[PDB]
Amino acid sequence: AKYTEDQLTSWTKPPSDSEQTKLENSEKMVREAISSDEKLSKKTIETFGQGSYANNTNVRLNSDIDINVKYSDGFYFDLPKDKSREDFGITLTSYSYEEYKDDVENALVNKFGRSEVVRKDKCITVKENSYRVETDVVPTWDYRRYSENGNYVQGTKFKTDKGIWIDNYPKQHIANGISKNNNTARRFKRLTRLHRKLRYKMIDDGGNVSDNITSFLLECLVWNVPNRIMNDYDTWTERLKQSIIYLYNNTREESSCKEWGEVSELLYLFHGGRKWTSKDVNSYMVLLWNHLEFLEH
Ligand SMILES: O=c1ccn([C@@H]2O[C@H](COP(=O)(O)OP(=O)(O)OP(=O)(O)O)[C@@H](O)[C@H]2O)c(=O)[nH]1
Ligand SMILES: O=c1ccn([C@@H]2O[C@H](COP(=O)(O)OP(=O)(O)OP(=O)(O)O)[C@@H](O)[C@H]2O)c(=O)[nH]1
Ligand SMILES: [Mg+2]
Numbered sequence: 001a002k003y004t005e006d007q008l009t010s011w012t013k014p015p016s017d018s019e020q021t022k023l024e025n026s027e028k029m030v031r032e033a034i035s036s037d038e039k040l041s042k043k044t045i046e047t048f049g050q051g052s053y054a055n056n057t058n059v060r061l062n063s064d065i066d067i068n069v070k071y072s073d074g075f076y077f078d079l080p081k082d083k084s085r086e087d088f089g090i091t092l093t094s095y096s097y098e099e100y101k102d103d104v105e106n107a108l109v110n111k112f113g114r115s116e117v118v119r120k121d122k123c124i125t126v127k128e129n130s131y132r133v134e135t136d137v138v139p140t141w142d143y144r145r146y147s148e149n150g151n152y153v154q155g156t157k158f159k160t161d162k163g164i165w166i167d168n169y170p171k172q173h174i175a176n177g178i179s180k181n182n183n184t185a186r187r188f189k190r191l192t193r194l195h196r197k198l199r200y201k202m203i204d205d206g207g208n209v210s211d212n213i214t215s216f217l218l219e220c221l222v223w224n225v226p227n228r229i230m231n232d233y234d235t236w237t238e239r240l241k242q243s244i245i246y247l248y249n250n251t252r253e254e255s256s257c258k259e260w261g262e263v264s265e266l267l268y269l270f271h272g273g274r275k276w277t278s279k280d281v282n283s284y285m286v287l288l289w290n291h292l293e294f295l296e297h
Pocket of ligand 3: 050051052064065066
């Protein structure tokens, strides 16, 4: 074992006792930037956390906090092929996502100053000082995806500066992660923290980790590890070993994992459009296993 049980147990832990405080401070500052803007305050816009601080899975002290700002006065939607869009109800509006993101960047500059705000491809970064963590503000619009039965699932949708349209389901993501954490006696998110920290260590001491293995991907993988592997073992060394074994085994053939979804369970994990592959995950599991140096016979 390249690492001891104490070290792994320590790395299953939040990087500060004030994580929720930082998240709520970022949420409040973004919400105030919204509410004290002349243009946006007159629009239905919900400010809420997403990502590692909202899932209590962050492992890097004062890493970026993700704050979604979701416009909901008009929603994008997607219908099955056997349904008409006209029959559902159409709405035309002079407002667009591009103008919304420009407005959000304007409000952020107004509240925090242009030198503190940095527009990026998928977000708008507010720089960290001594009182606030660096915050990625993510402007999105309401999004509905309808199924055959008439029910819809609700989420967020946005357009990158490079013109790519992205759909997300952050609320269902957080809800499902909370459910699994409850049903694992709070071991799911500890194992997620351990995996994230291990990825960072491997990248730091020189290891060759693929850029396709993201933190969101690691979280979705640990999400896909069945609860029994977390519940039915007694040390973190063994839970980690078994989770790696499971992910490796079920990523050797695309058939074993082509049905896995992300934490929201509303999008597939390996159905194209992703920057990773199941072979990428399998290679990463091999690299991590060889890094950990478990005892063998
Ligand atoms: O590919 C993606 C990436 C991101 N997202 C959505 O954007 C949220 C934050 O996107 P992040 O890339 O920041 O993931 P993370 O916060 O969990 O890990 P860090 O790198 O920040 O440490 C994610 O929680 C997810 O809801 C997706 O839906 N798909
Ligand atoms: O699908 C996504 C992706 C990203 N995000 C949010 O935008 C932030 C940007 O984080 P990313 O790392 O995913 O985008 P990038 O512009 O840095 O491109 P790469 O070179 O890293 O591949 C993320 O931290 C997340 O909060 C989403 O909300 N949804
Ligand atoms: Mg994040």
